[PDB]
Amino acid sequence: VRTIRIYQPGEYQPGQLLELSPEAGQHVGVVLRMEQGEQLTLFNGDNKEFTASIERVKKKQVFVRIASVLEVNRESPLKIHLAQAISKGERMEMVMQKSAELGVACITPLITERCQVKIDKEKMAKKMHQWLNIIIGACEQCGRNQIPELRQPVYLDQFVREAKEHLKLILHPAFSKTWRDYPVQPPDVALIIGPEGGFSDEEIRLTSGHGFLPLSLGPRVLRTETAAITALSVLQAAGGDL
Template sequence: MRISRIYHPGALHSDQELELTSDASNHVANVLRSKVGQPVVLFNGDGNEYSGEFIDVSKRKVRVQIDAKLSISLESPLSIHLGQGISRGDRMDLVLQKSVELGVTEITPLITERCGVKLDAQRWQKKHAQWQKIIIAACEQCGRNVIPTLHMPTEFQAWVNQSTPALRLTLHPRAEKSFRHTAVGSDGVRLLIGPEGGFSDQELYQTEQGGFHTVQLGPRVLRTETAAITAISALQAIYGDL
């Protein structure tokens, strides 16, 4: 029997009885159809997980008794901050989900010149909340007990010009170097991926001025979601834990 992993905001500790959030309760009772007495694992992002069992399961309320705190880390030794050009539809959702599974540390959605999504500040807040739920669900699925930081959508130039000790990398099919020939150190990587239509000439110039090095994943032009997933996989295979 597969043991459910559930995110719960707030403090957790051994010998604690608690009620899950309404969203989690609905998922446990009506989607997973869990029963009283079944085991469960909770996590809150503090790097630990907490084992317990369901002690009350109804359609609107689920209670859990925690019995132990477990220090289990699945975090990669390689720190990756993904700057992802925002794309339309489920492409952005896919990148967020898979990058979490692959071990990224931070994610910043980037508003670029060719960004296909134009929203006001209030709607960006709602989009950020939606993306946060995707990230948490990915952590529940893949076993991570640390939730990657999701920053608010940021203007491209502001992010590119941020000071960082990390190695700055972006993709180009005609770059001279591959990931294998980069010098990734203990400060990790700041990885820049363009949107569906790619970067404008002005943005490419800004990446050069911002100290980004171009690397290639082969001679073919990849879709934005393919580029992000493949680049993170390559970095983790060479410098991380894949």
């Protein structure tokens, strides 16, 4: 039967009593209605799985005893840094969930010329929190024991100037280049996915001038969220662990 996986950051060790975070204790004690003696698999984000037993439960307050730890790595050797354009109507929540399932290593929300997002500092902080919770849930579900880094949103110019990945790709139709044209292999790859409206000529000159090379994915127009799934699948199959 399926074990219960719970993300719980910290430096706890076998033998210790641990009080779960309010988020973990809400999940375990309130949502799942778990009781004394039941087993959990905690992971702290460092590719470790901790087997733990529930010692005491009071609503969201859950204390557990750490029994043992095992190194368990389900990360791809190809570390993909996805820069995903934020635009109104495009399903960023799906990208966050599925990119985590597909092993993405780092996610940067991206603001480009043709994105339609209206900037609000308070709205963005709430979205960033919701997206991080979605990523965490996806890691609980899919078995990843490291959480992808979710970086603060940046504009395209900052992203391309600062990218240090060894291969740098952008979903774009120029020259009809495919996976056959690239050596996709570890250590890493940066991937820019733009909004439905694409990139301006000036943005294309900027990305090309910083070493981003275009990647097409077939003759059919993919929704922004489908493009993320498809691009990560293709990259992981080509040079990662699919």
